[PDB]
Symmetry: C2
Subunit: 184 residues, 2 copies
Amino acid sequence: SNAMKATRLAIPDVILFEPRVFGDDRGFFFESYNQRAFEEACGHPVSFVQDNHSRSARGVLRGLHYQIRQAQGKLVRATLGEVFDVAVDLRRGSPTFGQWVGERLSAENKRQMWIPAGFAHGFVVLSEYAEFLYKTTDFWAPEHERCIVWNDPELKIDWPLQDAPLLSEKDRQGKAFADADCFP
Amino acid sequence: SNAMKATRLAIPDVILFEPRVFGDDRGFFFESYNQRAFEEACGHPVSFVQDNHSRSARGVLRGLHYQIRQAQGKLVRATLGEVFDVAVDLRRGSPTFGQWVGERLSAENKRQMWIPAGFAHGFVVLSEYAEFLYKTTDFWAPEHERCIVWNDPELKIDWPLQDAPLLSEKDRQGKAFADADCFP
């Protein structure tokens, strides 16, 4: 809280974090995670069992991914370059079921998004390259991973792209939101 | 373990981790932390309450730091550039009390060091800039932070430097290892 600012997004359980920076670009220090500030913001204890690090080229779009079994919360940020990061609410009975929020996360702005279990997640690289880090509350389970296609016409996500994104074949084959199984 | 390799250093409780990379420099993914592989390696459960991110210029040397109260284990790695990272055993009765180990950690080699509670830690930046990330098991306590000076003649740490390092005044004033209070 002295370590950073937290802002609830339009889906209020999705939280945008922004660490306080001590120093400048010739030399700085910041807390990228503080369990006390985090658990204050989301309102419950959280354990992170797996951290991931990816590198992707401009226009690469990964998502929209979720797993129903071993449901994962994800705390995500960019340590190189810039992405547009999206969370989609897939929780049964949520008053924001089927809505999305998106934010630009970059190495410069140091912003982070907390995406609770029960959401789908995706991002697109806006810079020449982006390196993307995330802490997750359960282990990735490829046999349980589901996908909703990035350009679903009901979700109507406003991806800040001019050129068509670069997708894996699996993400190109993502389900329509109408057809997607969701969280109990 | 499929996620990465672990190597016990000359002080065997200091562990060098090296994640498996999927892909290449045009696009990759790796696990930077896996609780199952980590707890297998160090032999006990571990919770990380605080993550830090720093940026430092060539020749900057931070350390050698430890806190006796709120003793911290540190899992450290470099996401930009290259550092030489050092751990010094300060545990009462350790058969390696007063010994050190050091490793080059870089964004390219993706190596990490686990430095248990009871050790002092420092690093020097070898590249033009380095960004240094670490996960810690207790909160930083500036009122409890102790320092042993980097060039202590008993420790005889082989810093891979040609030019004199750039130190904060506090680190320049670090105690001699002979005079340092250590861990119960």
